[PDB]
Each structure stands twice: as C-alpha cells, then as structure tokens.
Amino acid sequence: IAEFKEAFSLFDKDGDGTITTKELGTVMRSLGQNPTEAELQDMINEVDADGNGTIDFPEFLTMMARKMKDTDSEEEIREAFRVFDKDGNGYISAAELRHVMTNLGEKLTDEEVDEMIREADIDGDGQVNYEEFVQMMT
Ligand SMILES: [Ca+2]
Ligand SMILES: [Ca+2]
Ligand SMILES: [Ca+2]
Ligand SMILES: [Ca+2]
C-alpha cells in the first residue's frame, strides 16, 4: 500500500492529493513515452471513478490493486505455458503437449493430443501459441 502510495507521490508533482493530466504527462515523459493531451485525458478518465477530473489516492490504489491482480494471473498463466512449451520456442507442439500430459498423469494418444491442439489452434499452424493458450484456458 505504502509502495503504492509512494508511487502516487511521484505522480502528484505538487502534492495537493490529486494527479492531473499535466502531472501524468510529466511522468510518462520521464518514462520514455510522450502521449498527446488526448491520450493523457483518456488515461485519467479510465481511472477517474468520481469523474471530478483528477485522480486521488483511493482511485489510484483501486486501479493498482486490479492491475496487480491482473498481472499476477498473467504471470501465472505464463508460467503454465512455459511448462508446456518445453523447447521454449513460443509454441506448444503436439509432442510437447503429449509429453507434459504424461507428466500430469494423462497418457494420451497422438489422435487425442491432435484433437486437443485443433480445438485450440485458431490460426491453424498445427500448434498452440500463448494467445491461443490463454483463450482455451478462458
Ligand atoms: Ca497534484
Ligand atoms: Ca477523481
Ligand atoms: Ca515448443
Ligand atoms: Ca496455432
């Protein structure tokens, strides 16, 4: 929380308790991004729960708690995908899947693992990439 309040303190350049689009802009610029006023206003609006035009700590903390929880769940889905992607090439092959499933207690045939890939293989390249992996978890 204090880590999140500490982050808040860097955005609030003048310490009045709120983050304006200009203050957000100043930070983003120090991060190697130079968004247009248009973009900056979208970013504020996305977080500005009471609509008053600026972001306060409770608004900031609330978005960060979701972003943390979203980030935690992606890190963990990413962990699972690597486990399946044995050679690490970013695609899960029929053979890696079959092999990892046997490790998961499920001795499957080439036909069964082939159907499992096809059900997941949106782009049709005979394998499962990370995007397709997340969809069939979903
Ligand atoms: Ca301020
Ligand atoms: Ca607000
Ligand atoms: Ca692979
Ligand atoms: Ca595919």
CSV table of all heavy atoms in Angstrom, one decimal, residues 53-101:
chain,number,residue,atom,x,y,z
A,53,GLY,N,-12.3,14.8,-12.6
A,53,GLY,CA,-11.2,15.3,-13.5
A,53,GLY,C,-9.8,15.0,-13.1
A,53,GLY,O,-8.8,15.2,-13.9
A,54,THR,N,-9.6,14.6,-11.8
A,54,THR,CA,-8.3,14.2,-11.3
A,54,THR,C,-8.4,13.0,-10.6
A,54,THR,O,-9.5,12.5,-10.1
A,54,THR,CB,-7.7,15.3,-10.4
A,54,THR,OG1,-8.6,15.4,-9.3
A,54,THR,CG2,-7.7,16.7,-11.0
A,55,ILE,N,-7.2,12.4,-10.3
A,55,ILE,CA,-7.1,11.0,-9.7
A,55,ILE,C,-6.6,11.2,-8.3
A,55,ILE,O,-5.5,11.8,-8.1
A,55,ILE,CB,-6.1,10.1,-10.5
A,55,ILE,CG1,-6.5,9.8,-11.9
A,55,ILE,CG2,-5.9,8.8,-9.7
A,55,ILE,CD1,-8.1,9.5,-12.1
A,56,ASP,N,-7.3,10.7,-7.3
A,56,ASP,CA,-6.9,10.7,-5.9
A,56,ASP,C,-6.4,9.4,-5.5
A,56,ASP,O,-6.4,8.4,-6.3
A,56,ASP,CB,-8.0,11.3,-5.0
A,56,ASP,CG,-9.2,10.3,-5.1
A,56,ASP,OD1,-9.1,9.1,-5.4
A,56,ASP,OD2,-10.4,10.8,-4.8
A,57,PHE,N,-5.8,9.3,-4.3
A,57,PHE,CA,-5.1,8.1,-3.9
A,57,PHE,C,-6.1,6.9,-3.9
A,57,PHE,O,-5.7,5.8,-4.5
A,57,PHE,CB,-4.3,8.2,-2.6
A,57,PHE,CG,-3.6,6.9,-2.2
A,57,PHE,CD1,-2.7,6.3,-3.2
A,57,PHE,CD2,-3.8,6.3,-1.0
A,57,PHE,CE1,-2.1,5.2,-2.9
A,57,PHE,CE2,-3.1,5.1,-0.8
A,57,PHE,CZ,-2.2,4.5,-1.7
A,58,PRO,N,-7.3,7.1,-3.4
A,58,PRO,CA,-8.2,6.0,-3.4
A,58,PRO,C,-8.6,5.4,-4.8
A,58,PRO,O,-8.5,4.2,-5.0
A,58,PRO,CB,-9.4,6.5,-2.6
A,58,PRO,CG,-8.8,7.5,-1.6
A,58,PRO,CD,-7.7,8.1,-2.4
A,59,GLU,N,-8.8,6.3,-5.7
A,59,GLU,CA,-8.9,6.0,-7.1
A,59,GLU,C,-7.6,5.3,-7.6
A,59,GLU,O,-7.7,4.2,-8.3
A,59,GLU,CB,-9.2,7.2,-8.0
A,59,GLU,CG,-10.7,7.7,-7.8
A,59,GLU,CD,-11.0,9.0,-8.4
A,59,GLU,OE1,-10.1,9.8,-8.7
A,59,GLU,OE2,-12.2,9.3,-8.5
A,60,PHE,N,-6.5,5.8,-7.3
A,60,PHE,CA,-5.2,5.3,-7.8
A,60,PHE,C,-4.9,3.8,-7.3
A,60,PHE,O,-4.5,3.0,-8.0
A,60,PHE,CB,-4.0,6.2,-7.4
A,60,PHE,CG,-2.7,5.8,-8.0
A,60,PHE,CD1,-2.2,6.4,-9.1
A,60,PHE,CD2,-1.9,4.9,-7.3
A,60,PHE,CE1,-1.0,6.0,-9.6
A,60,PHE,CE2,-0.7,4.5,-7.8
A,60,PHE,CZ,-0.2,5.1,-9.0
A,61,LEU,N,-5.3,3.7,-6.0
A,61,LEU,CA,-5.0,2.5,-5.2
A,61,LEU,C,-5.9,1.4,-5.8
A,61,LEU,O,-5.4,0.3,-5.9
A,61,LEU,CB,-5.2,2.6,-3.7
A,61,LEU,CG,-4.9,1.4,-2.9
A,61,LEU,CD1,-3.5,0.9,-3.2
A,61,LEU,CD2,-5.1,1.7,-1.5
A,62,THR,N,-7.1,1.8,-6.0
A,62,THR,CA,-8.1,0.8,-6.5
A,62,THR,C,-7.8,0.3,-7.9
A,62,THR,O,-7.9,-0.9,-8.2
A,62,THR,CB,-9.5,1.4,-6.6
A,62,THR,OG1,-9.9,1.8,-5.3
A,62,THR,CG2,-10.5,0.5,-7.2
A,63,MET,N,-7.2,1.1,-8.8
A,63,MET,CA,-6.8,0.6,-10.2
A,63,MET,C,-5.6,-0.2,-10.0
A,63,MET,O,-5.5,-1.2,-10.8
A,63,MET,CB,-6.6,1.8,-11.2
A,63,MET,CG,-5.4,2.7,-11.1
A,63,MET,SD,-3.8,2.1,-11.9
A,63,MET,CE,-3.4,3.6,-12.7
A,64,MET,N,-4.7,0.2,-9.1
A,64,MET,CA,-3.4,-0.6,-9.0
A,64,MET,C,-3.7,-1.9,-8.4
A,64,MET,O,-3.0,-2.9,-8.7
A,64,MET,CB,-2.5,0.2,-8.1
A,64,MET,CG,-1.9,1.4,-8.7
A,64,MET,SD,-0.9,1.1,-10.2
A,64,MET,CE,0.4,0.0,-9.5
A,65,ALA,N,-4.7,-2.1,-7.5
A,65,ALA,CA,-5.0,-3.4,-6.9
A,65,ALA,C,-5.5,-4.4,-8.0
A,65,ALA,O,-5.2,-5.5,-8.0
A,65,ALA,CB,-6.0,-3.2,-5.8
A,66,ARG,N,-6.3,-3.9,-8.9
A,66,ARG,CA,-6.8,-4.7,-10.0
A,66,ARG,C,-5.6,-5.0,-11.0
A,66,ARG,O,-5.4,-6.1,-11.4
A,66,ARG,CB,-7.9,-4.0,-10.8
A,66,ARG,CG,-8.4,-4.7,-12.0
A,66,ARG,CD,-9.5,-4.0,-12.7
A,66,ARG,NE,-10.5,-3.6,-11.8
A,66,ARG,CZ,-11.4,-4.4,-11.2
A,66,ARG,NH1,-11.3,-5.7,-11.4
A,66,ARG,NH2,-12.4,-3.9,-10.4
A,67,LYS,N,-4.8,-4.0,-11.3
A,67,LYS,CA,-3.7,-4.2,-12.2
A,67,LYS,C,-2.7,-5.2,-11.6
A,67,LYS,O,-2.1,-6.0,-12.3
A,67,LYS,CB,-2.9,-2.9,-12.5
A,67,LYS,CG,-1.6,-3.0,-13.4
A,67,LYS,CD,-0.5,-2.1,-12.9
A,67,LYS,CE,-0.4,-0.8,-13.7
A,67,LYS,NZ,0.3,-0.8,-14.9
A,68,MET,N,-2.5,-5.1,-10.3
A,68,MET,CA,-1.7,-6.1,-9.6
A,68,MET,C,-2.3,-7.5,-9.7
A,68,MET,O,-1.6,-8.5,-9.9
A,68,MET,CB,-1.5,-5.8,-8.1
A,68,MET,CG,-0.3,-6.5,-7.5
A,68,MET,SD,1.3,-5.8,-8.2
A,68,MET,CE,2.4,-7.2,-7.9
A,69,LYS,N,-3.6,-7.6,-9.6
A,69,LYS,CA,-4.2,-8.9,-9.6
A,69,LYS,C,-4.3,-9.5,-11.0
A,69,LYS,O,-4.0,-10.7,-11.2
A,69,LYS,CB,-5.6,-8.9,-8.9
A,69,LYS,CG,-5.6,-8.8,-7.4
A,69,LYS,CD,-7.0,-8.5,-6.9
A,69,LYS,CE,-7.0,-8.7,-5.4
A,69,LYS,NZ,-8.3,-8.1,-4.8
A,70,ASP,N,-4.4,-8.6,-12.0
A,70,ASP,CA,-4.4,-9.0,-13.4
A,70,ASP,C,-2.9,-9.5,-13.8
A,70,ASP,O,-2.8,-10.5,-14.5
A,70,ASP,CB,-4.8,-7.8,-14.2
A,70,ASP,CG,-6.4,-7.6,-14.2
A,70,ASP,OD1,-7.0,-8.4,-13.5
A,70,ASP,OD2,-6.9,-6.8,-15.0
A,71,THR,N,-1.9,-8.7,-13.3
A,71,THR,CA,-0.5,-9.0,-13.5
A,71,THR,C,-0.1,-10.3,-12.9
A,71,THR,O,0.7,-11.1,-13.4
A,71,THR,CB,0.4,-7.9,-13.0
A,71,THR,OG1,0.2,-6.7,-13.7
A,71,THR,CG2,1.9,-8.3,-13.1
A,72,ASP,N,-0.6,-10.6,-11.8
A,72,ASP,CA,-0.3,-11.9,-11.0
A,72,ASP,C,-0.9,-13.0,-11.8
A,72,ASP,O,-0.2,-14.1,-11.8
A,72,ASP,CB,-0.9,-11.8,-9.6
A,72,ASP,CG,0.0,-11.0,-8.7
A,72,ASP,OD1,1.0,-10.5,-9.2
A,72,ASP,OD2,-0.4,-10.9,-7.5
A,73,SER,N,-2.1,-12.9,-12.3
A,73,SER,CA,-2.7,-14.0,-13.0
A,73,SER,C,-2.1,-14.2,-14.4
A,73,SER,O,-2.1,-15.4,-14.9
A,73,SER,CB,-4.2,-13.7,-13.2
A,73,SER,OG,-4.8,-13.5,-12.0
A,74,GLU,N,-1.6,-13.2,-15.1
A,74,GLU,CA,-0.9,-13.4,-16.3
A,74,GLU,C,0.5,-14.0,-16.1
A,74,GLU,O,0.9,-14.9,-16.8
A,74,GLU,CB,-0.7,-12.0,-17.1
A,74,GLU,CG,0.1,-12.2,-18.4
A,74,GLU,CD,0.4,-10.8,-19.0
A,74,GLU,OE1,0.0,-9.8,-18.4
A,74,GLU,OE2,1.1,-10.8,-20.1
A,75,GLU,N,1.1,-13.6,-15.0
A,75,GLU,CA,2.5,-14.2,-14.7
A,75,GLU,C,2.3,-15.7,-14.5
A,75,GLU,O,3.2,-16.5,-15.0
A,75,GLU,CB,3.0,-13.5,-13.4
A,75,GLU,CG,3.7,-12.2,-13.7
A,75,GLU,CD,4.2,-11.6,-12.5
A,75,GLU,OE1,4.0,-12.1,-11.3
A,75,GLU,OE2,4.9,-10.5,-12.6
A,76,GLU,N,1.2,-16.1,-13.9
A,76,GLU,CA,1.0,-17.5,-13.6
A,76,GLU,C,0.5,-18.3,-14.8
A,76,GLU,O,0.9,-19.4,-14.9
A,76,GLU,CB,-0.1,-17.6,-12.4
A,76,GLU,CG,0.4,-17.1,-11.1
A,76,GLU,CD,-0.7,-17.2,-10.0
A,76,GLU,OE1,-1.7,-17.8,-10.3
A,76,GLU,OE2,-0.5,-16.7,-8.9
A,77,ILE,N,-0.2,-17.7,-15.7
A,77,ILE,CA,-0.6,-18.3,-17.0
A,77,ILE,C,0.6,-18.5,-17.8
A,77,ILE,O,0.8,-19.6,-18.5
A,77,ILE,CB,-1.8,-17.5,-17.7
A,77,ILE,CG1,-3.0,-17.7,-16.8
A,77,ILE,CG2,-2.0,-18.0,-19.1
A,77,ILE,CD1,-4.0,-16.7,-17.1
A,78,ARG,N,1.5,-17.5,-17.7
A,78,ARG,CA,2.7,-17.5,-18.5
A,78,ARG,C,3.6,-18.7,-17.9
A,78,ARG,O,4.3,-19.3,-18.7
A,78,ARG,CB,3.4,-16.2,-18.4
A,78,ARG,CG,3.0,-15.1,-19.4
A,78,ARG,CD,3.4,-15.5,-20.9
A,78,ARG,NE,4.8,-15.6,-20.9
A,78,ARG,CZ,5.5,-15.8,-22.0
A,78,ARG,NH1,5.0,-15.9,-23.2
A,78,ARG,NH2,6.9,-15.9,-21.8
A,79,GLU,N,3.5,-19.0,-16.7
A,79,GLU,CA,4.4,-20.0,-16.0
A,79,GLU,C,3.9,-21.3,-16.5
A,79,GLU,O,4.7,-22.1,-16.9
A,79,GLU,CB,4.2,-19.9,-14.5
A,79,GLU,CG,5.1,-18.9,-13.9
A,79,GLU,CD,4.9,-18.7,-12.4
A,79,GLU,OE1,4.0,-19.2,-11.8
A,79,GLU,OE2,5.8,-18.0,-11.8
A,80,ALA,N,2.6,-21.4,-16.6
A,80,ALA,CA,2.0,-22.7,-17.1
A,80,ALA,C,2.3,-23.0,-18.6
A,80,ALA,O,2.7,-24.1,-18.9
A,80,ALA,CB,0.5,-22.7,-16.9
A,81,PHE,N,2.2,-22.0,-19.4
A,81,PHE,CA,2.6,-22.1,-20.8
A,81,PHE,C,4.0,-22.5,-21.0
A,81,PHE,O,4.3,-23.3,-21.9
A,81,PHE,CB,2.4,-20.8,-21.5
A,81,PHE,CG,2.7,-20.8,-23.0
A,81,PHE,CD1,1.8,-21.3,-23.9
A,81,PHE,CD2,3.9,-20.2,-23.5
A,81,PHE,CE1,2.1,-21.3,-25.3
A,81,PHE,CE2,4.2,-20.2,-24.8
A,81,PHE,CZ,3.2,-20.7,-25.7
A,82,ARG,N,5.0,-22.0,-20.2
A,82,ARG,CA,6.4,-22.4,-20.4
A,82,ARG,C,6.6,-23.8,-20.0
A,82,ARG,O,7.4,-24.5,-20.6
A,82,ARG,CB,7.3,-21.5,-19.5
A,82,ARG,CG,7.5,-20.1,-20.0
A,82,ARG,CD,8.6,-19.3,-19.4
A,82,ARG,NE,8.2,-19.0,-18.0
A,82,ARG,CZ,7.7,-17.8,-17.7
A,82,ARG,NH1,7.3,-17.0,-18.6
A,82,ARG,NH2,7.4,-17.6,-16.4
A,83,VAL,N,5.8,-24.3,-19.1
A,83,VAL,CA,5.9,-25.7,-18.6
A,83,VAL,C,5.5,-26.6,-19.8
A,83,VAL,O,6.2,-27.6,-20.1
A,83,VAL,CB,5.0,-26.0,-17.5
A,83,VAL,CG1,4.9,-27.6,-17.2
A,83,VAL,CG2,5.5,-25.4,-16.2
A,84,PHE,N,4.5,-26.2,-20.6
A,84,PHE,CA,4.1,-27.0,-21.7
A,84,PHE,C,5.1,-26.8,-22.9
A,84,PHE,O,5.4,-27.7,-23.6
A,84,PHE,CB,2.7,-26.6,-22.1
A,84,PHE,CG,1.7,-27.2,-21.2
A,84,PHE,CD1,1.0,-26.5,-20.3
A,84,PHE,CD2,1.3,-28.5,-21.4
A,84,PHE,CE1,0.1,-27.0,-19.4
A,84,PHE,CE2,0.3,-29.1,-20.6
A,84,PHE,CZ,-0.3,-28.3,-19.6
A,85,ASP,N,5.6,-25.5,-23.1
A,85,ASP,CA,6.5,-25.2,-24.2
A,85,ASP,C,7.9,-25.6,-23.8
A,85,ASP,O,8.7,-24.8,-23.4
A,85,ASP,CB,6.4,-23.7,-24.5
A,85,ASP,CG,7.3,-23.4,-25.7
A,85,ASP,OD1,7.7,-24.2,-26.4
A,85,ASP,OD2,7.5,-22.1,-25.9
A,86,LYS,N,8.2,-26.9,-23.9
A,86,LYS,CA,9.4,-27.5,-23.4
A,86,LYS,C,10.6,-26.8,-24.0
A,86,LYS,O,11.5,-26.3,-23.3
A,86,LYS,CB,9.5,-29.0,-23.7
A,86,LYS,CG,10.8,-29.6,-23.0
A,86,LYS,CD,10.7,-31.1,-22.7
A,86,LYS,CE,9.5,-31.3,-21.9
A,86,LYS,NZ,9.6,-32.7,-21.2
A,87,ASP,N,10.7,-26.7,-25.4
A,87,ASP,CA,11.9,-26.2,-26.0
A,87,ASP,C,11.9,-24.6,-26.0
A,87,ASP,O,12.9,-24.0,-26.4
A,87,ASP,CB,12.0,-26.7,-27.5
A,87,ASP,CG,11.0,-26.2,-28.5
A,87,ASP,OD1,10.1,-25.3,-28.2
A,87,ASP,OD2,11.0,-26.7,-29.6
A,88,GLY,N,10.8,-24.0,-25.5
A,88,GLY,CA,10.7,-22.6,-25.2
A,88,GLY,C,10.5,-21.7,-26.5
A,88,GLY,O,10.6,-20.5,-26.3
A,89,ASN,N,10.2,-22.3,-27.6
A,89,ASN,CA,10.1,-21.6,-28.9
A,89,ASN,C,8.9,-20.7,-29.0
A,89,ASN,O,8.7,-20.1,-30.1
A,89,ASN,CB,10.3,-22.6,-30.0
A,89,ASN,CG,9.0,-23.4,-30.3
A,89,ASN,OD1,8.1,-23.5,-29.5
A,89,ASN,ND2,8.9,-23.8,-31.6
A,90,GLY,N,8.0,-20.8,-28.0
A,90,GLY,CA,6.8,-19.9,-28.0
A,90,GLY,C,5.6,-20.6,-28.6
A,90,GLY,O,4.5,-20.0,-28.7
A,91,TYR,N,5.8,-21.9,-29.0
A,91,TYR,CA,4.6,-22.7,-29.5
A,91,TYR,C,4.6,-24.0,-28.8
A,91,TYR,O,5.7,-24.7,-28.6
A,91,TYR,CB,4.7,-22.9,-31.0
A,91,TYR,CG,4.7,-21.7,-31.8
A,91,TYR,CD1,5.9,-21.0,-32.0
A,91,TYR,CD2,3.5,-21.2,-32.3
A,91,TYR,CE1,5.9,-19.8,-32.7
A,91,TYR,CE2,3.5,-20.0,-33.1
A,91,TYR,CZ,4.7,-19.3,-33.3
A,91,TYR,OH,4.7,-18.2,-34.0
A,92,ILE,N,3.4,-24.5,-28.4
A,92,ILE,CA,3.3,-25.8,-27.8
A,92,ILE,C,3.0,-26.8,-29.0
A,92,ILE,O,1.9,-26.7,-29.6
A,92,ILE,CB,2.2,-25.9,-26.8
A,92,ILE,CG1,2.5,-25.0,-25.6
A,92,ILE,CG2,2.0,-27.4,-26.3
A,92,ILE,CD1,1.2,-24.8,-24.7
A,93,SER,N,3.9,-27.8,-29.2
A,93,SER,CA,3.7,-28.8,-30.2
A,93,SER,C,2.8,-30.0,-29.7
A,93,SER,O,2.7,-30.1,-28.5
A,93,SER,CB,5.1,-29.3,-30.7
A,93,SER,OG,5.8,-30.0,-29.6
A,94,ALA,N,2.3,-30.7,-30.7
A,94,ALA,CA,1.6,-32.0,-30.3
A,94,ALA,C,2.5,-32.8,-29.3
A,94,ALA,O,2.1,-33.3,-28.2
A,94,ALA,CB,1.2,-32.8,-31.5
A,95,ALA,N,3.8,-32.9,-29.6
A,95,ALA,CA,4.6,-33.8,-28.9
A,95,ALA,C,4.9,-33.3,-27.5
A,95,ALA,O,5.0,-34.0,-26.5
A,95,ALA,CB,5.9,-34.0,-29.7
A,96,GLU,N,5.1,-32.0,-27.4
A,96,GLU,CA,5.4,-31.4,-26.0
A,96,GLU,C,4.1,-31.6,-25.2
A,96,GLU,O,4.2,-31.9,-24.0
A,96,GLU,CB,5.8,-29.9,-26.1
A,96,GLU,CG,7.1,-29.7,-26.8
A,96,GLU,CD,7.3,-28.2,-27.2
A,96,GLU,OE1,6.2,-27.5,-27.5
A,96,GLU,OE2,8.4,-27.8,-27.1
A,97,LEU,N,3.0,-31.3,-25.8
A,97,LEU,CA,1.7,-31.5,-25.0
A,97,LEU,C,1.6,-32.9,-24.6
A,97,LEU,O,1.2,-33.2,-23.4
A,97,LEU,CB,0.5,-31.1,-25.9
A,97,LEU,CG,-0.9,-31.2,-25.3
A,97,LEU,CD1,-1.0,-30.6,-24.0
A,97,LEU,CD2,-1.9,-30.6,-26.3
A,98,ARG,N,1.8,-33.8,-25.4
A,98,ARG,CA,1.6,-35.3,-25.1
A,98,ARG,C,2.5,-35.6,-24.0
A,98,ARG,O,2.2,-36.3,-23.0
A,98,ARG,CB,1.8,-36.2,-26.3
A,98,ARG,CG,1.4,-37.6,-26.0
A,98,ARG,CD,1.4,-38.5,-27.2
A,98,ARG,NE,2.6,-38.5,-28.0
A,98,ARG,CZ,3.7,-39.2,-27.9
A,98,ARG,NH1,3.8,-40.1,-26.9
A,98,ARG,NH2,4.6,-39.2,-28.8
A,99,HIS,N,3.8,-35.1,-24.1
A,99,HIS,CA,4.8,-35.5,-23.2
A,99,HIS,C,4.5,-34.9,-21.8
A,99,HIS,O,4.8,-35.6,-20.8
A,99,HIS,CB,6.1,-35.1,-23.7
A,99,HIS,CG,6.6,-35.9,-24.8
A,99,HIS,ND1,7.4,-35.4,-25.8
A,99,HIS,CD2,6.3,-37.2,-25.1
A,99,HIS,CE1,7.7,-36.4,-26.7
A,99,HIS,NE2,7.0,-37.5,-26.3
A,100,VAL,N,4.1,-33.7,-21.7
A,100,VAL,CA,3.8,-33.0,-20.5
A,100,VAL,C,2.5,-33.5,-19.8
A,100,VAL,O,2.5,-33.7,-18.6
A,100,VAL,CB,3.8,-31.4,-20.7
A,100,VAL,CG1,3.2,-30.7,-19.6
A,100,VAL,CG2,5.2,-31.0,-21.0
A,101,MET,N,1.6,-33.9,-20.7
A,101,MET,CA,0.4,-34.5,-20.1
A,101,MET,C,0.7,-35.9,-19.4
A,101,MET,O,0.1,-36.3,-18.5
A,101,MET,CB,-0.7,-34.8,-21.2
A,101,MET,CG,-1.3,-33.5,-21.7
A,101,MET,SD,-2.0,-32.5,-20.3
A,101,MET,CE,-3.5,-33.4,-20.1
